[PDB]
Amino acid sequence: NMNIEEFTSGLAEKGISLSPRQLEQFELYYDMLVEWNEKINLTSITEKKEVYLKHFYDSITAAFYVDFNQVNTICDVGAGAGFPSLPIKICFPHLHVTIVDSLNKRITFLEKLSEALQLENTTFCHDRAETFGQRKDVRESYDIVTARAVARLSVLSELCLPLVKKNGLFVALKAAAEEELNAGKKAITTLGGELENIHSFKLPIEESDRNIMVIRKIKNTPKKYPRKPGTPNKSPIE
Secondary structure, three states, rough: OOOHHHHHHHHHOOOOOOOHHHHHHHHHHHHHHHHHHHOOOOOOOOOOHHHHOOOOOHHHHHHHHHHHHHEEEEEEOOOOOOHHHHHHHHOOOOOOEEEEEEEEEHHHHHHHHHHHHHOOOOOEEEOOHHHHHOOOOOOOOOOEEEEEEEOHHHHHHHHHHHHHHEEEEEEEEOOHHHHHHHHHHHHHOOEEEEEEEEEEEEEOOOEEEEEEEEEEEEEOOOOOOOOOHHHHHHHOOH
């Protein structure tokens, strides 16, 4: 239920002023997302104002709490539709963005999307996150690793923290309890992280709860993590 002006003015209030190019990039993103969503499952939400609020604005909220001007490289362990890293990339076009996804059909969408949007320095990798994080080339190589996921925090941490460089950040965009946070906290410590902040707020208009967790990579991840594809899900660290 967010119109273009509410989108534009909402971001302006948070220090993000969109150019005509950036605004056209979001229009194109919307068009392509809904078109490809006819071919494959990419989004549960297709009404334009809903997508602007729940995908674009929701993704960009990360930038309200972490300063993307101070970093260079992002890795997104995503749901295949580019959230939240691509809206962030549109807002912060200096960023080098990598997205890893397990479905090649979604990788194809992201490649076409990036080309249409004329994005520079984007890398899309068809891979299981468990496989990706063991690769010598990418392990502990990113300034910020983002994930907007339903995944249990303990599972998400195993997938994400091994990709964060020492002293970098893992930023988790979530919608909420005490039990999974507690298990999450223990996994985070095991994986070489330290929880810095949980920011709790509501999405505008809808007023639904959101939480963003910012975790600092304070030491190296043990070599055993991430475990083999499917192991984190079957037997989460905590």
